[PDB]
């Protein structure tokens, strides 16, 4: 009954470390896709929401260099996203007085109101997405991911990042 | 000595489910950045390598729709990447005989040789990246990520994916 010579080939067995990269990539994609659709009426991408969040931790105002240091993304990516947010009335850029060529970036009241709304929806989205894993699995998942982050980030970010020390209770 | 009113505000404490999304995003970014630089002399992005890998599991030849079903990414993304790979001599597209408007996609010998090389480097890269977590932590990390994937993928992919059943030993 079973056809011959059709079954998976050797490229379907991976080193476990390679399978973990596949698993990270797939989870990142499936969560982002579902979250992005729930948040469509606020017009946010995951990176725009990240930048709103980071600026909120910085009190709503900062400079491109301080923001870039606090967040994982590349500075050129961050500057492109910030310009798009500026176009959309989310970010106000002002020439620092006297400090020539230095820019200040500030969330508008619209951005802050959007962040309010998007944070409350996002909490609900991530909680329903992760309801199938236990509190203990969640704690361990953050510990292992944090180890991976701490061992890999310095391979290409040499003192250029001081990532926001997020906590949970 | 310690300055007042300067310390993190309430946006630096997250729900654990939100912190896990931050942790997934950060690990995905730090691993991709370091891997992409090691693989620069083959000119591969993580998605191009993924598409080479998936086509290798399919025996080097397939159609855009079968490839799209096997892989996590959106079909329009996959088609853009495939066209870029075609430009680079990695993919050959041929009009199916008689089956009008149907396309076959096939890895060139150059692509297959590149995949060979990139797979061997990638195994070494992911292993050195993950040497700080144990075999048991790695096994559990894949199990938890797999649960997250299985609960979230169907929120936006309704029977449209039959993901490649990758194994490890
Ligand atoms: O830096 C962040 C803040 C909130 C969400 C996310 Cl994904 C990130 Cl990377
Ligand atoms: O589908 C895949 C095959 C190899 C590597 C990766 Cl990241 C993916 Cl998503």
XYZ file of C-alpha atoms and ligand atoms in Angstrom:
356
model
C 0.000 0.000 0.000
C 2.676 2.626 1.111
C 4.481 4.168 -2.019
C 8.321 3.713 -2.057
C 11.039 6.413 -2.237
C 8.681 9.262 -1.316
C 9.329 9.603 2.309
C 11.291 12.843 3.960
C 14.985 13.046 2.860
C 17.982 13.855 5.010
C 17.333 17.651 4.942
C 14.259 17.137 7.117
C 16.406 16.087 10.080
C 18.153 19.104 11.557
C 20.705 19.704 14.341
C 18.668 20.673 17.391
C 20.253 24.170 17.395
C 19.062 24.674 13.772
C 15.596 23.429 14.628
C 15.473 25.943 17.493
C 16.245 28.780 15.050
C 13.403 27.452 12.798
C 11.083 27.342 15.864
C 12.045 30.973 16.940
C 11.481 32.207 13.339
C 8.114 30.502 13.080
C 6.779 31.692 16.430
C 8.022 35.241 15.746
C 6.144 35.137 12.381
C 2.871 33.599 13.599
C 2.564 35.915 16.655
C 3.476 39.035 14.670
C 0.939 38.216 11.919
C -1.964 37.658 14.362
C -1.005 40.654 16.621
C -0.587 42.941 13.597
C -4.071 42.172 12.354
C -5.630 42.854 15.798
C -3.886 46.187 15.919
C -4.681 47.201 12.294
C -7.119 49.972 13.325
C -4.273 51.704 15.129
C -1.973 51.284 12.073
C 0.941 49.835 14.099
C 3.638 47.447 13.093
C 5.488 45.570 15.842
C 8.505 47.920 15.411
C 6.417 51.107 15.578
C 4.747 49.827 18.757
C 8.233 48.930 20.147
C 9.462 52.470 19.436
C 6.353 53.980 21.113
C 6.943 51.691 24.128
C 10.654 52.549 24.389
C 9.916 56.300 24.133
C 7.217 55.930 26.850
C 9.888 54.347 29.142
C 12.049 57.402 28.364
C 9.217 59.765 29.451
C 7.916 60.533 25.906
C 11.044 62.426 24.759
C 14.577 61.438 23.835
C 17.195 61.675 21.034
C 17.718 59.232 18.127
C 21.005 57.992 19.748
C 19.571 57.302 23.202
C 16.531 55.523 21.698
C 18.892 53.416 19.417
C 20.972 52.366 22.469
C 17.891 51.230 24.424
C 16.288 49.109 21.677
C 17.509 45.962 19.887
C 16.951 47.139 16.257
C 19.655 48.656 13.965
C 19.928 52.464 14.154
C 19.252 52.945 10.399
C 16.027 50.875 10.806
C 15.037 52.835 13.815
C 15.630 56.154 11.969
C 13.509 54.989 8.987
C 10.685 53.981 11.345
C 10.905 57.207 13.305
C 10.578 59.225 9.986
C 7.513 57.256 8.974
C 6.092 57.894 12.514
C 6.897 61.586 12.078
C 4.947 61.602 8.794
C 2.005 60.102 10.640
C 1.976 62.737 13.381
C 3.326 60.242 16.047
C 6.742 61.860 16.467
C 7.735 65.486 16.641
C 11.387 66.240 15.782
C 12.880 69.469 16.964
C 16.298 71.020 16.435
C 18.032 71.158 19.794
C 18.684 74.880 20.654
C 22.373 75.688 19.971
C 23.458 71.939 19.967
C 23.706 72.147 16.137
C 22.652 69.022 14.096
C 21.324 67.414 17.296
C 17.648 66.404 17.106
C 15.101 65.781 19.881
C 12.304 63.291 19.281
C 9.012 63.467 21.250
C 5.758 61.586 21.205
C 2.758 63.683 20.242
C -0.434 63.514 22.401
C -1.944 61.408 19.601
C 0.939 58.911 19.897
C 0.619 58.708 23.641
C -3.146 58.100 23.335
C -2.471 55.431 20.676
C 0.101 53.758 22.887
C -2.418 53.652 25.784
C -4.913 51.856 23.540
C -2.367 49.536 21.839
C -0.824 48.477 25.167
C -4.173 47.391 26.569
C -5.075 45.381 23.398
C -1.519 43.888 23.177
C -1.648 42.587 26.753
C -4.916 40.763 25.951
C -3.549 39.429 22.625
C -0.296 37.995 24.121
C -2.120 36.494 27.046
C -4.694 34.654 24.877
C -1.830 33.562 22.543
C 0.156 32.054 25.355
C -2.700 30.560 27.495
C -1.601 27.036 26.445
C 1.722 27.232 28.283
C 1.914 27.267 32.069
C 3.247 29.949 34.360
C 6.311 27.742 34.923
C 6.868 27.106 31.239
C 6.608 30.894 30.649
C 9.159 31.670 33.399
C 11.616 29.120 32.054
C 11.067 30.259 28.406
C 12.045 33.836 29.409
C 15.117 32.542 31.269
C 16.364 30.455 28.384
C 15.620 33.167 25.762
C 17.448 35.666 28.013
C 20.516 33.458 28.113
C 20.455 33.128 24.329
C 20.083 36.910 24.003
C 22.993 37.611 26.422
C 25.320 35.175 24.606
C 24.415 36.321 21.033
C 23.830 40.095 21.230
C 27.600 40.810 21.987
C 28.647 38.896 18.866
C 27.554 41.945 16.836
C 26.685 44.619 19.394
C 29.874 45.624 21.152
C 28.882 48.138 23.852
C 26.515 49.769 21.442
C 23.384 48.580 23.342
C 22.193 49.140 26.870
C 18.848 47.335 26.496
C 15.877 48.500 28.598
C 15.849 46.357 31.752
C 12.240 45.204 31.501
C 10.787 43.414 34.541
C 7.652 41.367 35.176
C 6.006 40.463 38.670
C 23.774 60.425 46.821
C 21.072 58.658 44.614
C 19.143 61.288 42.425
C 15.315 61.345 42.969
C 12.532 60.814 40.384
C 14.849 59.293 37.769
C 14.300 55.677 38.319
C 12.314 53.256 35.625
C 8.586 54.192 35.273
C 5.634 51.842 35.087
C 6.194 51.017 31.367
C 9.342 49.098 32.294
C 7.306 46.424 34.082
C 5.535 44.230 31.555
C 3.052 41.325 31.710
C 5.153 38.180 31.436
C 3.490 37.305 28.089
C 4.563 40.729 26.701
C 8.080 40.274 28.013
C 8.229 36.895 26.251
C 7.322 38.572 22.938
C 10.127 41.140 23.608
C 12.537 38.243 24.377
C 11.525 36.310 21.137
C 11.955 39.523 19.065
C 15.351 40.258 20.561
C 16.755 36.753 20.164
C 15.413 36.540 16.592
C 17.193 39.875 15.837
C 20.534 39.135 17.526
C 20.878 35.622 15.996
C 19.837 36.783 12.520
C 22.312 39.707 12.587
C 25.296 37.535 13.626
C 24.335 34.604 11.283
C 23.778 36.985 8.355
C 27.240 38.454 8.704
C 28.883 34.984 8.817
C 27.068 34.031 5.661
C 27.733 37.326 3.790
C 30.137 35.719 1.274
C 27.305 33.489 0.105
C 24.928 36.503 -0.148
C 22.107 34.817 1.827
C 19.437 36.301 3.984
C 17.712 34.039 6.514
C 14.630 33.828 4.218
C 16.650 32.951 1.103
C 18.439 30.210 3.054
C 15.017 28.994 4.358
C 13.688 28.812 0.787
C 16.809 26.894 -0.370
C 16.360 24.500 2.588
C 12.639 23.957 1.925
C 13.283 23.327 -1.800
C 16.068 20.839 -0.872
C 13.501 18.931 1.288
C 11.249 18.908 -1.800
C 14.057 17.352 -3.917
C 15.237 20.640 -5.545
C 12.034 21.230 -7.564
C 8.500 22.283 -6.722
C 5.796 24.885 -7.544
C 5.245 28.280 -5.849
C 2.035 26.926 -4.163
C 3.585 23.771 -2.712
C 6.620 25.726 -1.432
C 4.242 28.389 0.139
C 2.276 25.629 1.945
C 5.438 24.073 3.424
C 7.009 27.283 4.782
C 5.807 29.744 7.446
C 6.233 33.000 5.423
C 3.430 34.801 3.484
C 3.075 33.702 -0.160
C 3.631 37.247 -1.541
C 6.913 37.421 0.472
C 7.944 34.054 -0.743
C 7.223 35.040 -4.388
C 9.281 38.261 -4.028
C 12.196 36.277 -2.571
C 11.959 33.600 -5.229
C 12.143 36.347 -7.988
C 15.222 37.870 -6.407
C 16.731 34.313 -6.225
C 15.829 33.836 -9.889
C 17.682 37.065 -10.743
C 20.710 35.698 -8.933
C 20.758 32.409 -10.840
C 19.544 30.385 -7.743
C 16.105 29.513 -9.115
C 15.035 28.457 -12.564
C 11.343 29.026 -13.395
C 9.812 27.074 -16.204
C 6.346 27.139 -17.737
C 4.707 23.806 -17.020
C 3.996 22.068 -20.410
C 0.271 22.454 -21.249
C -0.727 23.328 -17.579
C -1.092 26.990 -18.686
C -0.026 29.742 -16.169
C 1.431 27.050 -13.885
C 5.122 27.560 -13.056
C 7.762 25.072 -11.865
C 10.597 26.314 -9.672
C 13.939 24.435 -9.470
C 17.233 25.002 -7.749
C 20.154 25.504 -10.101
C 23.412 23.522 -9.516
C 24.886 26.777 -8.183
C 22.071 27.021 -5.604
C 22.504 23.442 -4.525
C 26.272 23.970 -4.116
C 25.581 27.173 -2.139
C 23.113 25.367 0.086
C 25.717 22.638 0.806
C 28.186 25.302 1.942
C 25.646 27.450 3.864
C 24.225 24.436 5.728
C 27.637 23.411 7.019
C 28.492 26.990 8.190
C 24.966 27.480 9.689
C 25.228 24.322 11.800
C 28.513 25.610 13.285
C 27.080 29.127 13.828
C 23.905 27.943 15.671
C 25.847 25.503 17.771
C 28.399 28.107 18.967
C 25.494 30.568 19.554
C 23.625 28.152 21.745
C 26.575 26.498 23.622
C 25.527 28.333 26.825
C 22.256 26.426 27.169
C 22.173 22.739 28.042
C 20.847 19.843 26.022
C 17.852 19.753 28.388
C 17.202 23.469 28.145
C 17.358 23.144 24.319
C 14.871 20.230 24.295
C 12.435 22.089 26.522
C 12.852 25.371 24.532
C 11.822 23.520 21.326
C 8.836 21.954 23.115
C 7.553 25.224 24.491
C 8.158 27.139 21.212
C 6.340 24.316 19.375
C 3.327 24.675 21.631
C 3.286 28.429 21.049
C 3.562 27.852 17.289
C 0.709 25.269 17.269
C -1.614 27.560 19.269
C -0.840 30.777 17.279
C -0.336 29.697 13.646
C -4.097 28.705 13.242
C -5.191 32.168 14.387
C -4.228 33.436 10.912
C -3.345 30.334 8.900
C -6.504 28.315 8.436
C -5.492 25.116 6.609
C -3.234 27.120 4.383
C -0.023 25.631 5.899
C 1.258 22.099 6.160
C 4.630 22.970 7.726
C 7.634 20.719 7.009
C 7.803 18.169 9.840
C 11.429 18.771 10.794
C 13.009 16.281 13.214
C 16.208 16.224 15.261
C 17.975 13.085 16.923
O 11.797 47.017 22.699
C 10.527 46.579 22.642
C 9.486 47.131 23.404
C 8.215 46.580 23.291
C 7.935 45.502 22.422
C 9.022 44.977 21.709
Cl 8.867 43.580 20.636
C 10.316 45.497 21.805
Cl 11.725 44.805 20.824
O 11.574 26.893 6.926
C 12.852 27.081 7.300
C 13.901 26.234 6.916
C 15.181 26.504 7.387
C 15.460 27.612 8.218
C 14.365 28.405 8.590
Cl 14.520 29.783 9.686
C 13.062 28.158 8.146
Cl 11.641 29.243 8.624
